[PDB]
Amino acid sequence: LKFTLDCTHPVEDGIMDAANFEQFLQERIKVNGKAGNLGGGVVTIERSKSKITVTSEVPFSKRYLKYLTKKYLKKNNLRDWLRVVANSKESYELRYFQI
Amino acid sequence: PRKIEEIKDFLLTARRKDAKSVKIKKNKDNVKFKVRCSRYLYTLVITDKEKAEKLKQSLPPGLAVKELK
Amino acid sequence: SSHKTFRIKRFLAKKQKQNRPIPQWIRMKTGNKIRYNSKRRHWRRTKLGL
Amino acid sequence: KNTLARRKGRHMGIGKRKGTANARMPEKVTWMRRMRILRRLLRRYRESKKIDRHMYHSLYLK
RNA sequence: GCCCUCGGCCGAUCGAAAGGGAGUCGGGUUCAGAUCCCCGAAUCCGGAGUGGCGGAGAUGGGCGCCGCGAGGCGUCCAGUGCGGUAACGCGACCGAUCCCGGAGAAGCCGGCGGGAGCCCCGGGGAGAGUUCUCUUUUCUUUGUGAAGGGCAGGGCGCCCUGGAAUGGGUUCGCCCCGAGAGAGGGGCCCGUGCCUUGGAAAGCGUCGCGGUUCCGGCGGCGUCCGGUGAGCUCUCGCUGGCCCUUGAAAAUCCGGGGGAGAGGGUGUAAAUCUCGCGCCGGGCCGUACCCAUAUCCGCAGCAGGUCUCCAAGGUGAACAGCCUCUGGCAUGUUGGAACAAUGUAGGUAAGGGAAGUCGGCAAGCCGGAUCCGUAACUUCGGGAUAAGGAUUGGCUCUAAGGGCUGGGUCGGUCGCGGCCGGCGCCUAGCAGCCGACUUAGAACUGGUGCGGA
RNA sequence: GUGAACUAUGCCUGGGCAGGGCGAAGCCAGAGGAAACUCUGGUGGAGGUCCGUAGCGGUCCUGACGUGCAAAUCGGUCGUC
Ligand SMILES: [Mg+2]
Ligand SMILES: [Mg+2]
Ligand SMILES: [Mg+2]
Ligand SMILES: [Mg+2]
Ligand SMILES: [Mg+2]
Ligand SMILES: [Mg+2]
Ligand SMILES: [Mg+2]
Ligand SMILES: [Mg+2]
Ligand SMILES: [Mg+2]
Ligand SMILES: [Mg+2]
Ligand SMILES: [Mg+2]
Ligand SMILES: [Mg+2]
């Protein structure tokens, strides 16, 4: 459903890696309570060198997306600078905490 | 508040004497024409954009034709 | 109470208008022998009979 | 979580109830539910002519 | 103004900031006021002689001609509306004294049903919390006033057809029927629910942009889809029970009976109008705040007293007790340091078990629920939870208890679907889907613990 | 002469009172009898009914206090609901 997850600023100043974050999602997604294998090829994640599309054919949810990116930020000790907001419909953009 | 069905009835209450104002409210699906008279606020709802436009053209002069934007 | 009559409102109006300290030039007046308002009412201590 | 367990039957017990059986589930409500169910079934059978008026009345009274 | 006609309020007046009593709501705003100010939507009552504008009353028939006819000419006669078998309906739709009725205007208790609000469950958003591990997670939020119009829903001893025993409908209970059942078709009332106008422009939640020392700034996006119920609380309705108890009055407003009267001579008419719109007005007094372990009374910031409304989650029978959220507070007119006696309040106690004492005073024992089992006596109702006994946790299951849909033999043809029929036999019903809380039984399990507070 | 602002009682008009137990009349069904009827199971929800909240009251500790918090209060236990 094109839940565009966009992070240009942190990879812009080089504090996280879109490829291994994509790997993190690729392992720890869930479809019907199963990790790995994307439900059996049913969700597809591409990274267009600055942002990640998570296309799907199931009722998958962007609040679950926000929960997973918060989990990634907490795991990599980053969510004291970064903050996941809804910049638009069908998209989540990370932002730095006030300067 | 009263809701008017026909353009001719809207036009005669628009050219009534006590008709203080007309406000045009452009909604996403339709357009509302609210004429403020003495006792009631009368509302006409039109779904056709060109029909609403030609009504705006054929509205009588000497009235406030205020758009709500 | 908040439900008053006009004349009990007048009574309370007069009482709170005259519950007021004495001016200070009164003491400088010649032959004064009055130092303070001696009949000032406090709402908690002395109650109106009304 | 405890509501899920009580749905599965847990903590319902006999050492877990404090009111009487009628206080927890009233016999008037039970009988009323049963009568509504059985009368509705009899009305459907009489409408679809699996039974007739006379069978319906005797079964109603029973 | 006089005269005639007609006439019981037959008794002044006061008496309720909880009785009766037309008609205002939403948002915003203050240091302190707001249903009263501002903005926006309404509404009630009173007034209109010259009547302010529409609409209703109300505008049709007969006969002679002209005119192809339509349509005109003149004459004569109606007209205080119309529809439905009905219940009744429609936008108005004359009418006095007088009379009749209704509303205002009726107790307490029970049981059900409908509607809302709250609570609860499943998803979608937005923003937060947790992330040592797990958690598609946890928390918050997720609007539409009054007044119109339409439709659900509820109620009806309201109407018409028809005639019912092999009696039948029907409630939790009842109850109903030749004085008219069931069935079929209507009508009315209520409509606080939903849709719409109001209305998104406002409110709210988020994400931003610039400073009018503080803009009802400006913008984006959103404000979504469902399901449950003997839940609680209001409210509406139906139907019972109780009474040597039968549960106000009056202002006020309405309907009807009757028809004294009034309206015009067929006009582009009148009297009249409880219809629609328009115009003007609504004075006087109260309105802050406290409302009580500190604004009241008790001589006081006094453990006393003093009438109400609203009421979340868990456990649980529960408005019990105990813990928590919204909201509130600072321990009740001081603190610090020690932890003697005597106290006040609360516990525990070997072995005995009322020997204590006037006296089992005080304390203790018992306690919930489920399954058994209950004596004398009796006014036959009771006694009665008599007495007495067993069980009670956690975890994993197994049964039973419901609600929706569809069951169709074949194009015999076309209006990969539709019209009539040769075409066919779940008829012991099945098939699919949805959804609750219970109750009973069993296994395992624990230092025999389990109404664990 | 002044008082029913406390209290006593009558009247008028308002407000209020969880959750449970027992299970009266009325009613439905099944079974036994020649009847009269009888038995069983439900339903129903009566009562100056019972346990027990709020409320109202005030038993006992002859508890606290007794120059009090109080010119009659407080706590537990109680009565009724
Ligand atoms: Mg005082
Ligand atoms: Mg008289
Ligand atoms: Mg008076
Ligand atoms: Mg009054
Ligand atoms: Mg205020
Ligand atoms: Mg709305
Ligand atoms: Mg009938
Ligand atoms: Mg908006
Ligand atoms: Mg905004
Ligand atoms: Mg006030
Ligand atoms: Mg006090
Ligand atoms: Mg005094």
Ligand SMILES: [Mg+2]
């Ligand atoms: Mg406590």
Ligand SMILES: [Mg+2]
């Ligand atoms: Mg203390």
Ligand SMILES: [Mg+2]
């Ligand atoms: Mg202190």
Ligand SMILES: [Mg+2]
């Ligand atoms: Mg104090």
Ligand SMILES: [Mg+2]
């Ligand atoms: Mg001992």
Ligand SMILES: [Mg+2]
């Ligand atoms: Mg011992």
Ligand SMILES: [Mg+2]
């Ligand atoms: Mg002894």
Ligand SMILES: [Mg+2]
């Ligand atoms: Mg002795």
Ligand SMILES: [Mg+2]
């Ligand atoms: Mg002795």
Ligand SMILES: [Mg+2]
């Ligand atoms: Mg004792």
Ligand SMILES: [Mg+2]
């Ligand atoms: Mg005995």
Ligand SMILES: [Mg+2]
């Ligand atoms: Mg066991």
Ligand SMILES: [Mg+2]
């Ligand atoms: Mg008195």
Ligand SMILES: [Mg+2]
């Ligand atoms: Mg009693």
Ligand SMILES: [Mg+2]
């Ligand atoms: Mg009590």
Ligand SMILES: [Mg+2]
């Ligand atoms: Mg006492």
